[PDB]
Structure 1
Amino acid sequence: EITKTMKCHVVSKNKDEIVKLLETLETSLIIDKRVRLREDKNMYLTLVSVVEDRESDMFTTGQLTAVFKMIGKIKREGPTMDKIYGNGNL
C-alpha cells in the first residue's frame, strides 16, 4: 500500500475565482472517487480525504490537501501445470 498526502494550490488575481476553482476541483475529486494514473487505465488512485484550508497561504502552503492511496502487487510468477500424466499398475 502506497499513500500520499498531496497538497494543491490555486493562484489567481481574483480570489473569488480561487474559491470557485477549488470548489469545482473538490466536487470533481469527490464525485469521481478515483483518478486515472495513466491513460492505459489499469492503475488508479482511490481518494481518501480532500480538505481545503482557505486561510492557508496561496503560494507557500496551498489551499487544498488531498490524500490518495494505491495498492500494488508483488510481481512474482512461476511455472504452471499445463499438462499432467500418469499410468496405472497393480
Structure 2
Amino acid sequence: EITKTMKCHVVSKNKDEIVKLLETLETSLIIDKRVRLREDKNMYLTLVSVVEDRESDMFTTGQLTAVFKMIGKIKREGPTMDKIYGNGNL
C-alpha cells in the first residue's frame, strides 16, 4: 500500500477565481473518486480525503490537501513446472 499526501496550490490574480477553481477541483475529485495513473488504465489512485484550508498561504503552503492511496501486487514471474515426472517402487 502506497499512501501519498499531495497538497495542491491554486494561484490567480482574482481571489474569487481561486475559490471557484478550488471548488470545482474538490467536486471533481470527490465525484470522480479515483484518477487514472497512466493512460494504460492499469493503475488508479483512489482518493481518501480532500481538505481545503483557505487561510493557508497561496505559494508556500497551498490550499487544497488531498490524500491518495494505491495498492500494488508484488510481481513474481518465477519458473514454471513445464515438466512433472515421477517414478515408482514398492
When normalised by structure 1's length, the TM-score is 0.88
Unpaired runs of 5+ residues, structure 2, are none
45-54 vs 75-84, which moves further? 75-84
Post-superposition CA distance 1:39-87 (Å, at most 9, x none): 1110100000000000001011000000000111111123445676789
Partner residue of 1:67? 67
Residues in 2 aligned to 1:58 and 1:72: alpha-carbon distance in whole angstroms? 34
Distance in 2 (alpha carbons) for counterparts of 1:27 and 1:83: 56
Q: Where does structure 1 differ by over 2 angstroms across 4 or more consecutive aligned residues?
A: 77-90
CA offsets 1:9-40 (integer angstroms, 9 cap, x no match): 00001000000000000000000000000111
Distance in structure 1 (CA, Å) of the matches to 2:32 and 2:55: 26
Instruction: Provide the alpha-carbon RMSD of the alignment.
Output: 1.8
TM (norm. structure 2) is 0.88
Question: What secondary structure sits across from 2:76 in the alignment?
Answer: coil
Gaps of 5+ in 1: none
Count residues with an aligned counterpart: 90
